Amino acid sequence: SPKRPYLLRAYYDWLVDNSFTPYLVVDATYLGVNVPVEYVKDGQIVLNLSASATGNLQLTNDFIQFNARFKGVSRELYIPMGAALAIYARENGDGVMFEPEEIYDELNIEPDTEQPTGFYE
Amino acid sequence: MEYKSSPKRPYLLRAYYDWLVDNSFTPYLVVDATYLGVNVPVEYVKDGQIVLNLSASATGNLQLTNDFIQFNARFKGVSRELYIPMGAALAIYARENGDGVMFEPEEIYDELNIEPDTEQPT
């Protein structure tokens, strides 16, 4: 239902097809993000999604996932689509900042915690 | 390189197209039938414009290329094939609600649509 995944994939292809290095701005504060906090700045990390800087990159409707190496330390990165803030070309900044969609809001996310119930029955 | 990057339209058209279909919507395309290179049933054009149904059941061998769109469709029984230059695709939306996107103008599309003031020899 959310359009963000299709728009991200569209820009990604346009970037790569034009020989641009696609940079993804991630809200490392969002629910489910999995990135090395050692490289996070002000609740925000910028990733390189080019073929070269990624292993097994997958751009799903629900998440971005890939193997990344930070100073020899290869590992997996998981980013829920709701955390993707923007994607642009490293060589010139051309890209898009994703428009907010109501569904990536925890209010629209199914109950993460249950209702106050008694105990006895 | 003064940075002569290609148009984004084909990518946006394609993505929105996939979004509509994956959501059970019927993709409708608004075309400028004037645009150089367009091949569509001239008698179904209104105000130099034609709306087309691109859903799976309304098309055959649909091709959403960076440069053009092409497919086979039937108009009142008469099966015809259409060729549409990307600069001619003006918008794509969902029939079930009139909600979609109207593409932003892109400089090169305008260039590819500049007409000569006069004809060629012969």
Swiss-Prot record, chain A:
GO CC terms in record: cytosol; ribosome
GO BP: any one term: positive regulation of protein catabolic process
The protein's assembly and partners: Homodimer.
Function description: Enhances recognition of ssrA-tagged proteins by the ClpX-ClpP protease; the ssrA degradation tag (AANDENYALAA) is added trans-translationally to proteins that are stalled on the ribosome, freeing the ribosome and targeting stalled peptides for degradation. SspB activates the ATPase activity of ClpX. Seems to act in concert with SspA in the regulation of several proteins during exponential and stationary-phase growth. Also stimulates degradation of the N-terminus of RseA (residues 1-108, alone or in complex with sigma-E) by ClpX-ClpP in a non-ssrA-mediated fashion.
Sequence similarity: Belongs to the SspB family.
Protein name: Stringent starvation protein B homolog
Gene: sspB
Full-protein positions shown: 6 to 126 of 150
UniProtKB/Swiss-Prot annotation, chain B:
Any one cellular-component term (Gene Ontology): cytosol
Any single biological process term in GO: positive regulation of protein catabolic process
Subunit structure: Homodimer.
Function: Enhances recognition of ssrA-tagged proteins by the ClpX-ClpP protease; the ssrA degradation tag (AANDENYALAA) is added trans-translationally to proteins that are stalled on the ribosome, freeing the ribosome and targeting stalled peptides for degradation. SspB activates the ATPase activity of ClpX. Seems to act in concert with SspA in the regulation of several proteins during exponential and stationary-phase growth.
Family indicated by similarity: Belongs to the SspB family.
Name used for this protein in its record: Stringent starvation protein B homolog
Record gene name: sspB
Range covered out of full length: 1 to 122 of 150
